[model samples]
Structures are given as structure tokens and as C-alpha cells.
Target chain A: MSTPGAQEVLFRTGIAAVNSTNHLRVYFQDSHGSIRESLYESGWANGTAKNVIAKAKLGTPLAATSKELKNIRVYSLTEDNVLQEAAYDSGSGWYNGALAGAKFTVAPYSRIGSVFLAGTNALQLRIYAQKTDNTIQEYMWNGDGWKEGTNLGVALPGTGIGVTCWRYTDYDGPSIRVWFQTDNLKLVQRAYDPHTGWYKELTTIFDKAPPRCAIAATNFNPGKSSIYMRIYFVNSDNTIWQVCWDHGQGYHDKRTITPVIQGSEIAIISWEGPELRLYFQNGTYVSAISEWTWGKAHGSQLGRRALPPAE
Target chain B: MSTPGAQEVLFRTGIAAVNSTNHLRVYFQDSHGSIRESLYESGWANGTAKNVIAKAKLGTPLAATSKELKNIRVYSLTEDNVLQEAAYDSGSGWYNGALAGAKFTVAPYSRIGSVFLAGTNALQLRIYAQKTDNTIQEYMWNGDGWKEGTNLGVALPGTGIGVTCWRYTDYDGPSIRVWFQTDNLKLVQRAYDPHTGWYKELTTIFDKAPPRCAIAATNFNPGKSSIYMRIYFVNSDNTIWQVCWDHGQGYHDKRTITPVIQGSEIAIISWEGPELRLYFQNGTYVSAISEWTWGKAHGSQLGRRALPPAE
Candidate 1:
């Protein structure tokens, strides 16, 4: 056996577009079981890639989100099936936080979904992962500390999870939305709002996807009359399917953009401007990355390249 | 084990309200694998119980729908995994149609869903059943004879399926809707329309149910400004849940009527006079049946009784 190179790393990328810092970052697990970060500060070529200084299972998927430019967190599952959080602050650079799931074990190779809620009083971070029992379990950090939260439900074993949040200005006070394929390939959603607490809402059930494909989601146009949410998943035909919802339009599902490789993973984040950026493994090149800005009427591929070599 | 009695029969009731004949019928599998029907003409007391001559696998769920008072069909699976349809007409009374699925067999004890389309030129009857591979297969009657149709995606093994149709005046030309739980228990919907043909639409993903529970659905207020749809299923806790939709009010889900036994079956139909009636196995009693008029704000149990003793 030989050490696997960067191009052979698993393709599940965790992405965040920080408004305060005006930058974008993607995190992934390298072939050697190291978590690495690639920075896109205006030009993807401008910044060097760095290791996150966290240990992970060789192919564990990453989940990253940010409350502000100065505060960002990336999550991955460790070799022992524990959830590990690697954090970054403008002042402190990079550090590892407490390990989660002391009571419940994470499923090996589970895809992590993270959302950061910027509350008035405290910063909150929520992470969801498939458990050993096939249920999606939550590890939450309120103002206080990390604790195990609700068990969402049984999910498809190989599918990734999608999650996003809308603040008070977006609609009702703080609310969270999550999407995952059930064991039968139907996309299911669980939501939380102040008034209703946590509830299951209607989502696209007519569509079917591969049980293990990736899902990417982003919430945009906050503090407006209606907050917009777009969730992306790979259809069984390899086409990208988009399910969109807003106050004006209840729900609309359509096949959108380009199709990718059968098992490619997806990552998306809304940038500062009117751009909804999406990333996925390049459809043609097994080891390259492709970007697209999807908020436009016709989204075009921005570029395809390998991540900057890790230092 | 002791021989099963009438009350101990599985409760997955198939129901249809005939507009042309001004009557209602409920078909169910009895303890002896006999398909029995209870009729309601102005009052439930006026009509007698009867059996639609058909052979069925013990405990297999029944599906019933009507194109007109003169044209009614109830479908069941046979001991040999064949799909059998029992039909009724003003002239011929009750009779069995040709056997279906000589090519592919149905899963043992699969729940069946049926819908009848009163097309302008031709009458249509569609039946859905879980196949041996867990995919829901359609058997169609397009005014001519019985034939196999599309294979809907895989579904939860033991969950009953919900299906209904809204004709031309209802909204679009004619659209058929179906709901079933995926293997992971998320309620999903597949719909068919003239323009798009068959497409999966949005349905409730936030809610969950027991894999073996039942679902009852109906379309009401047709030919009006906006047609209405109501779907009912048992939640994980055995409480009945209602998911409703209209053109004006998009989608709403709430815990509605009373809870029932852990695996009780449900049947529902819209009566002519401002009433939406629902039937389920009584919550407390092992072998009794209960009815409720659910359109009003407060729906009370109409009565609890045994099926007019099967002759």
C-alpha cells in the first residue's frame, strides 16, 4: 500500500462564503485522512491551501458554516466515530474544539451538515450526522455548550444531508431546515421554528435520487419580504435537481443546471452579492473541481481546477 | 393459533362514494380471506352487507374507486401474487375482470391504491401495488381491457398507499395523485397530468409513520373555484394526521382527528351533503369499526359497530 495523493481525496467538500471577510473557503478530507482548506479570496489562485490540523477518518465528509468572518467551524468524524470540530477565528487562527457524541456514536463515513445561527444573545451552531442506528442525530451548541439534540429520523445510509437557517428578519424568528434522503431514496425534511418548535414540513417526495448522493442547500435574500431557499440534489439520472421555496411561491421543483458524475458530492453557499455559488466534482475530470453561480437565469460554469496544493 | 373471526380481520378498508348511484361502499378483507362490502344508501342501516366474489391473499389490502355509479372497481392480490379486479356495472352487477401481472408478481400482502378517471371519450381505471421487488407497479384499464402500466419507485414494505384524482373542472384537465411511505417512512407523492405526464410532486417529508400503517385520501369541492384535497395517515404515535391543500391555501399539515390502534387501517370518502366521512378500526376495541364526519370543526365518532354480520 502507498500514501494516496491529494487528487485521490474524497470529493465531499464543505463550503462557506463569509460576508465580513468577503472570502470563500472549501474544506475536504484528503486521501491521507487529513482535513485541508482551500481559500478563494477573490481569485482561487491568490491563496495557498492549508491543513486544518484535525484528524479524520480517511474519507469522512466535512460540514462547514460561519456566523461571521471571524468565527467559522468545520466538522468531521474522527477515526473512532466521534464528531470533531475544527474552528477558526481571525484572532486565534485555527484550533480544534471539544469532541461531540460522547453518548452516541456517529456512523462511519456519515455526511455532516452544519448551520450557524447568529442569535442576538448568543452564537449557535448545529451539526447533524447519521448515527450508528441509521437515525440522523443532532449535536448542538447553544450559548452554553455542546450537547446531543433530537434524533431527526432514519435516513438513507449513503446520502449526504442538507441544512440551512433563516433568522428573524428572514421570516418568523429563528428557523432551521434540513433535508436528507430516507432509506428508500425519498428526500425528507425536518424544520424548527420558534412558535412551532420542531416540525416536519412538506417537501418534494415525487423525486428519487441515489441513496448515497450529496445534497447542497443555501438560504438567500434575508431581511426581505420573503426568504428564498434552494436545495440541490442529484437525480437518479445524474441530472441536478433544484427544489426552491419562498413566501410568494410555495414550492417548485425542477431539474436545473448540468449533470455530474454518478456519485459526485455537492457544496453551495450564497456570496455577498446576488450570486448563489455551487461547487461539485467536475463531471468530466474525476479529480477536478467545478464552480457555478446559479442565482442567474442561466448559470454557467465558472472554472474547473484542482485545489491549491496543501502546505 | 385459533381461527380468526370477522372482527379480527385486518382493517385496511377500501372505500368509494358513487355519485351516479347516490351510494357509498366499503370493501375489506375478512378473517377468511373473503372480500366483504358494506353499503350506505341514505342511512347506513338501509343497505345490507355483501361480498364481491374474489379470491385474495389473507390480509392483503384492498383498493376501490368509481368512474360512475355504473362503473366501479375493487382490486385485491390473489394467493398466487396475481392482481385481481372485481368490477360492478348497472347491467352486469358484480363480476371479476381478467387476472393481471402474468409477467411480474406482487409482493405478498401489499397495500393497493386505485383511481378511476372519467375521461370524456374513454373511461380509465388505474391500480397500484407493490411488486416483488418493492417497486409500486401500475395496472391500468383504459376503457378497453386490463394491462400493466408504469413501475413507481420503491416504497415502504407495509405502508398503505393513498391515491385520488381531480378531473377537468377540478383544476387541470385530469391529474392523478398518489402518496406512500418510502422504506424509511417519509410520505412521498407521485402525480400525473396530461401536459407533464407522470411526475413526482411535493408532499410531506417532515412527518413520519409506522411502516405498516394506513393512509386515506380524497378530493372534494370539484368544479368549484379551487378544488380541495385532504390526506390522512397515522403518525408515529398512532395519532391521525391531516395534510390538506387548495389553490388558495398552499399546504398545511396538522395533527387532526383521534388516534387509533398501532396498526389500524383507514378508509375515507366525501359524501354528497357537505360531509367528509372517515372510517377506521376503533381505537379501544379490537374488532369494532368507527366512523367520523371530519369536514366540520368538531368531528365526532358516528358510531362503533361490527360489519353487518357476513353471511
Candidate 2:
């Protein structure tokens, strides 16, 4: 049995964040195993990040993120393998809710992704777990109702450290693009096009990739030719790798960056319109290198992105 | 305080990705921040696939890619941390200069690698970087131009992700057969052979593999024999898995697929004749999910490979 402050299970925490009213709000599990956040901060930028750790302990913490950063939500696979959602809002703070209609459990929701399905305009959060066989399940919340995650197949050896989402220009309109790492730890993707409904067929984007690092994606400032969606991850070499896809082209070649601790998970959240900030654990198990060096040199990186700013 | 379109230093911009040709090419900073690339590109199908990203970013950003592809170049850090280059062209490209030869920069490249000894018709871009202690570095590009990456020593990680040039039964003579990725992430290679070299390291052909979900190797219509390069990766449950050795008696066997996301970051690049399409992310941040596709098509997935392909 775990003690009060004793971390029952020290699995890494993931974020499902949205930009709630300019505040670069963030979410994750805490020491006491509670879903916490650095609430209402100006942005993950250098001087704006503030705090309000673990606002919800509704259940076992798993993965987290937000759709547009408006509402902070985290998913935890309850004890009996039952799934649970802990969400927070400026006015409501934090509260636990059922999948409404989704029936799911662990296999461990190690990673989760959330987004506002473009055409549908429904806020959807896709939760994922790492399982042996192909029981890849996800629970998506479509604003008005709960559409339990269909049997999104094919999983692999995992920390299940996947579940990154973003909205991309779909020629037809904007569509929700959710990306995830699979069983053997490969990159797999799915999409929800309003006119086309949820497209089927799991496609293998990168057939030769490493596994177990962190995964995050965004379509912030894309190229004019096509909508460029950038997906970021930490390589085995402990450096950051960015793989972007243009709606016009295939994959726009791969990119690399780094200094991140190995085995560390990452959380990528959009602060404002074209700005996306990333956060990861440092050697000390705390977050660092959160803010990109986009802004002017804020003197020092200390308080730097709240200590995790690219230290 | 970060501006909206202001764009923070965003040191997080990630990848120094460059567009060498109409094709989307890429470049990455090694751990120490040295630029590196697999160079060139023909396209990515069972054919084409000439250059690789971040083969090594030396000189500068504007110019990425080595003289050509077909060479698997990697980087490492030395004690002094002075960035070095070990290239292997078909004995051409640039004249062999020094760390003094071609004047580069202070991007502050930290990783170093193995040797870069040059020769007549063949070349070897064997470089490497170690953890804390010493792993070392070296390189020497040919005068006119040449590139041939080979597997020479102890690569700590199983998937060194090394893809050099040279072949067998091209009747091209006994060539450098590349092999990497071992038990854990350790690298085990085989090559530099005229004969006996590839025979002994039998059994696993590639006892070491970079298990990327459903591991697939290609004879890609080999020239009778020997030209087959079998690739592999870790599977779920963290098993050091393998499927075939393309070179052995026959097709070793076929591996299974995953419940993972399809079209992941996989490494299956094939040349017109021997080329096989592959995927790999060469950056410091994340591991790529190279492939996806469940057993017998569970029907579909969300974000099914779009923005990319696999869609």
C-alpha cells in the first residue's frame, strides 16, 4: 500500500491542455497522485506561468490536455480499470465526470489527446492506453454527448506515451488530426473530417522510428503552400525531433532538437495563436526547457519558463 | 509577456529543416548542436529516397544534405566537444580538408563520433558520441566526391540507425553490409567484408534490430542474393524482437503488426531497384512511430495517415 504522500505508482504524467482565456494553463498528476495544474498563468512563456497544483484527485492519474486551453482536463484509469475524467474551468475550478457514454479501462491511459473536431465543432478528447493485444480503445467527448472511443486498433510495446492532437486545414474545411505511437512504438494517425465522417484505415506514417519518448503535435504557424502540422518527440539520443506534414506534401522531412532528459515524457500546449510551448522533466525530475527561445532573452532562463525553460 | 506573432526565441523552433530540392529535405543539430544529415533525396517510395536529414549540420543551415544519399552518417561528441565530420562518399564531393580543412562554425556541436578514414572508390563516414567517458570522433571527405557509410565498431545502441552505401552480388563485389541495433538500444553492426564477414554474424543476421512495431526487411527484388538488408525493432512488452535477416537461407519469417498507429515513423527506404520505402526521425527529441496497420485491418483508425499519406 502507498502512504499519504508516497507515490503509489510513479508513472510519468502527460498533459491535455487548452488555452483558457490567454492563460497558459497546464495539467498533470502530482506527488499525492492528484491531477494538478499551474492554473491561470499568463502563458507558458517565461514570466507568465503561475500555479495551482493537483486540483483533482478523482482517480488514478494517467494522461492530460485541453482543447484550445480553455478547459483543463486530465484522464485517469480508475482502480477497477474504470476510466474517469477530471476537468477544470476558471469559474468551476475542478470537477470529476464520467465518460458519459464511454466505457473504458486500463490497460493504462498513459497518453491522451484532445481537440475541437473542426467541422463537428465538438470538443473531443482522445484517450489511449498500452495493451498487449490490439485492444486500442479511446473515449472521445463530443461537446454535446459522449462518444465512447471506438476500438481504435493496433497498439505496441508501450508506455503508451502517445496521444497528440491538432486542427488542420482540410481543403474541405478544418479537421481534427489525432496522432499516436503504437504497440511496437511506431507513429500512427487518424482523422475526423466533417463531410467524410471519421475516416477508417490506420496508416503507417513513419515505419522506421524509435519508441517510448514523448509525443506532441501542432498546426500553429503553418506554411502557406499547405497546412503544415508539426509533431514533436524526444529521440533515444535524448534530443528533440520534429516531423511536420504539409497538407500539400507528405512528411516535410524530420527535425531534431534537445538536451531533454532520457525517458522523460513531454507536453506541448498552444499558448496563443501561433505560439506553442513545450514542457518536459529535467534531470531533477522537474520540468525544464518549456519555453522556446522565440521571445527576447529574458535575462536568464531561471524562473526560466518556470524552471523548465530549456535549462 | 510574449508577443502574439512576436515568436519567442523559440529555441524550440526545432529542426533546422532545409528544402534542398523541390522535395522536402531536412537537417538536424547533433547533441552538441552540430548539424548532420543523411544527405540527398530522390523521393520516398520503393524507389527514390536519396538523401537523409541531419546527416550532420556542419558548414551552415542554408546548405544541408551530403554530396548524395546512400550514406548513413551519424554524429557523436568528443571530450573537447569540438564538432568533427567523418564522411564516406564514393570518394568525391569535397576535398579532404581538416577540422582545419573546411571552415565551419560555433553552433556549438557537442557530440563526436567514430572514424572518417577515406580511400579510393569507397568511403566511410563512421562517427559516434558517447555518454560521459570517451567514445571519440573522426572524418575526411574525398576531393572530387564520394560517400559510402559503413558499420565499423561498437555502437552502444541497438538501432544506430546507420545506413551506409556498398552492396553485395552487384557482383559489385563483397561490400560493406550495414547492421545495427542490438538487445536493448545497443548497436551491433556487421560489414567491411569481402567475404567471411557477413557469414559468421548469422543466426540473427541482425541479432540487433530497432524494433519499429511490425518489423519488415526487404529483398526488394534483390540481385539473386546477399543484397537483402533485414531491419527490425522492439515490440510491446519491451521484447528485443526480430523477424528476418533478408540474407539468410531464405526469408526468415514475417513479424506481426501492432495495434499501434499506422504510418508511424518507420525506416523503410528503397531505391528504384533495391529501394524500399522506410521512415525514421533523426532528431534529439522524440522516437518516431514508423508504421501502423492492425491484423487483417480492424477496419480503421482516427487521424488515419493523412496530412502525410497512409491516409
Candidate 3:
């Protein structure tokens, strides 16, 4: 057993151009709960990183927003575990404080998921979170000022919550899928379709869904000809479960995506532009920046191109 | 616990026939809400299931359609439900007047959910229903019909209402996921797939959802590959919950695929080509026609075959 190390870590990275030079930026939660990041350009420039201890005075809960351009925001709860938001834009290239002041206690351990929306004037990112009280919370950035938080008015789950996002039909598409645990530890599922409202709540996909888990799902075939989706989760046993959502394969079962040990916290992305082929962890220390995918038996490859199922 | 009884049920049965010799069928609520069905052999056949007055008076609401060689249609109330549809070629059958000139009263109860599409011609099998106030419903057939249950343009929901259907490479491939609430009771869920359509919205999973409920989900490797898809609901205790969209385990939750349960009023279907698994109550003398299923432990054997969870 590779110890699986301290889990509960997550990552959100992207390539954004700052002052004309595009930089590959990445963010994740460290063992201490403090958020951190790394900017790698052609040469990883003065490549500065910070502990993100700004005025929020906390590190615990973490969530970060990503976009290819313009800006990105990172969120967390104060040491006392209250909600907080921070942003970084190419022009200023500096981090800022969270929304003035609204104290919403974050769940003992929580995660963040958001969908960027284009509003009448500015860009909007609706942020969703779970609270210590079993209610859902939502905080949105309307390109400028702030909006209030909606308690439990956000979505559903038994107390356990997790979210993953994507952009399709171009950026800011409504294709976001949220997975959470029910009171019974059953893995429940839900999705967001820009054109549709909510994709009805699904039954428990897992019988004894572990604690504080997150989901990594992808909107296959981006800006291309066709599309389908898949999701990944860390089970209570630390074993991973991968399943396809309407991927044209019909109803596929939960595939043990990988590993059999660790705390429950995960971040999944198609990093290669398709097929969630790479996944980092919820730990401060990295794990070989591992690379493994489902269906290697048939033909699952990791790369920069979106590959279709060989079967 | 009222031991909910062996449950109110129905079944659409058949064996897949390649050339047009396929035999498939089930019976359900009529206009006055009585039970009926067309047995098999295209030319429609001389069918019989009876008006299952096995238990309650208010027969459970229903939704049905048929096709290929012949075809039969079963519809219940605007009384407490909308429509449901499975798959069996059930063809683009035909769409005459819904319940004909009855102009059934759209009750505050009816609900709607579909199986899938691949249906026939331009024909689509869309199920429609009404809200007490008449502001919610969907329309379809795979083939031809006059739809005007426009309570909502059939527009998707936001803070309003919505539907979730899966789209194939083209438009209407086999995939339809529908979720709704009946009056103030439970948050009911129904779905169908094959060849299908806005499902127009992507909001949140639960609306605090309504109350008393019913769900028709399967982890079918249905008709072919085995699969799972179950739905969960909240109870009068206001606690949060389901079986997965594909229920398997012993307590697979929502009644069985056969003699299911009391919804407050309910509807379910293996849909496409097996056991509709019908139930209504016109006079209480009970219908001995009972059938159901659940995976006993590790080897979920359905009909003598040890099902392998599809990868």
C-alpha cells in the first residue's frame, strides 16, 4: 500500500494569457488546507507561488474557477470555515480579497463547483457549496459587485456534496454535472444543461459512498462533431469508480478508475482536451502526476488529442 | 408500516422478433381509468389483462403506445398524472386524439417520463400531461400528432419547469430523462431511451421536490445489455434520499420492476420490450397477475442468466 498519503486535496489548472504571453496556471489545496498555485510559461518565469492567506485568514475548504482567458477566481473558507472568494486577471496579475463580508459556515469539509454564464453586461460565475448545516449555498460574481448566497436553494444531496464543470457549444455551456452523497452514503447524481433546467436527481449510484468525495467528469467531443459525458469518483474504500453518462454506450457500470486507498477528495479533467485521462490528488505532495484511464483494455490512450472509443 | 402490499402493477411483455413476427405488449388505464391491453401478433391481436380492481378505486394513472405490425394505446387521467412510454418498437405507432373527445380534466396529479427513441419515421413518442393550474407538460411521437398541452410552450424550466432528454449524433436518438412533481407530494422521476430531444433546461436536482412519489428506473442491460438507473425521494419525515437510476441490491428501493408500490398513485415500466410490470383499481377483487425482480447478492441473475455489469 503506497500509504495513499493525506487525501482531501483537489486541483484546478488552466492556460491563460497574461500580458500577451499565455501561461499555464494551476491551483490546488495543500495538506494544511491552504490553497496554492504554479504558473508555467515557456520557462516557468519568475514562477511565483503563494499560500493564499489573504484577509480571509483561512485555508480549509477550497474551489477554483478556470477560463482560457480574461480571469479566474479561487475560493475557500476562513479558518473559522466561512465562505471566501479571490480572483486573478491577466491585466493586473494580482490576487484580491473575497466578497466584502458574508459569513456562511462551510461544511466540516466542502468543495466548490461553478458554471460561467454570460449576463446582459458582464460575465457571471455562479458558485455552489455545501454548508455545515446540510443546506446548499450559492454565491455568484456578476462581473462586478456581489450577489447573496442561497441556502439549500442551490441543489440537492444528502449532506455530502461534490461538483465538476465543462464548457461546450463553446465556452460557458450549461453542461455541468454535480455528484453528491445522500444521507445513506448513496452516491446521488445530477447535471446542468444550459438549455435545460436540471437533469432530474438520479438514484444512489453507490451503496456506501465514502466521505467528502468529489467528481471529475468530461463533456466528450468538444467543439467537434458529437458529444457524450463520463464521471469519476473515489469510493469509500479509496477505490475509484468511473461511469459514462449518456456516452452512447448505454448504461455502463462503475469502473474502478484506479487505486484502492486514500481519503475522499478528487479533481478530474480531460487535461488532454478529451477523455479524463489524467487526475491529480487532494494531497499537498504530488503522486508521479499519474496517468491511467478506463478501457485501456480496448484502447484508452493519454494525449493532447480527443480520442474516440476504439470499440 | 402499511406494508404497502404486493404493490399495484402492470407489464408490457414480448420476445424480440427480427422480421415483423415480434410479439410484445401490456395493458393500463383507459379514459374512465379501467385496465386493458393488446396481447400480441401484429394485427393487434385479441388481448386481455383486465381492469385490475385489485386494490384501490382511483386506478393508478397510466401512459402507453404500441406498434410495428398492429398497435394499442392506454391512457389514464388528466386526473392525477401525465404520460409514460417504454420501448418495443412501440413504433411511431399513431397519435389520434388523446383519450379522444373526453377532454379529460387535467388533474393536479399526473406525471410524465419516457423510455427512449429510434422510434419510427418522423414519428416521436412524446408523453404529455397537465399541472392542476395547467402550466406544465411535454409533447412528442417519433411520428405525427397535434400537441397543445402548452401549460409551460413546453418551454424548459428555470425557476419554472423543464425536461431532460438525451440527444444522439443527430437530434432524436434513443434517450429521454423526465423528472417532475405531483401536487404537493413527492418528487417523481421517469425516463426512456432509444432514439430521441430540450429537455430544454439544466437547473438544480431537487426543488425541495414535492411529496408521496413513484420512480421507474432500471439498471437494465435491458432487452440486451444489463444496466442500472434508479431514483431516490424524500419521505414524510422530510429526510433526504433512492435506489440508483439502476436499482439492483436486495432493497433495490422503489418496489420491484414488477409488483412495485403505492405512490400516493404510481406508474412504472421496464418499458421498451419486457414486463411493463400494470396496475390500477376499478373494483378491488385483485388481479393474480404479479411479477417482480431484485439482484440477490453478488450474482444478479435475471431470467436465469448471471448478468455481468457492462463495461
> How close to the true structure is residue A278 of candidate 1, measured as C-alpha lDDT?
71
For residue A253, give model 1's deviation from the true position in Å: 3.1
Cα deviation of A87, candidate 3, in Å: 0.9
lDDT of each: 0.64, 0.39, 0.39
Docking class of 2: incorrect
Top-lDDT structure, candidate number? 1
RMSD (CA, Å), candidate 2 to true, equals: 20.8
Candidate 1 displacement at residue A131 in angstroms: 1.4
Q: Over 4 Å off in model 2, which ranges?
A: A1-11, A20-22, A43-62, A65-70, A100-103, A119-132, A143-145, A159-174, A221-226, A271-273, A284-290, A293-311, B1-311
Off by over 4 Å in 3: A1-24, A31-33, A39-59, A97-100, A118-122, A148-160, A164-173, A194-196, A222-226, A271-277, A281-311, B1-311
TM-score of chain A of each: 0.86, 0.72, 0.68
Q: Each model's RMSD to truth, in Å?
A: 18.9, 20.8, 24.5
What is the C-alpha lDDT profile of model 2 across B188-248, one tens digit per residue?
A: 4444555554444522343322221223232233454454554544343232233454556
lDDT by residue for model 1 (B267-293), tens: 777744446767765422233455666
Candidate 2's DockQ is 0.01
State the number of backbone clashes in model 2.
Answer: 172
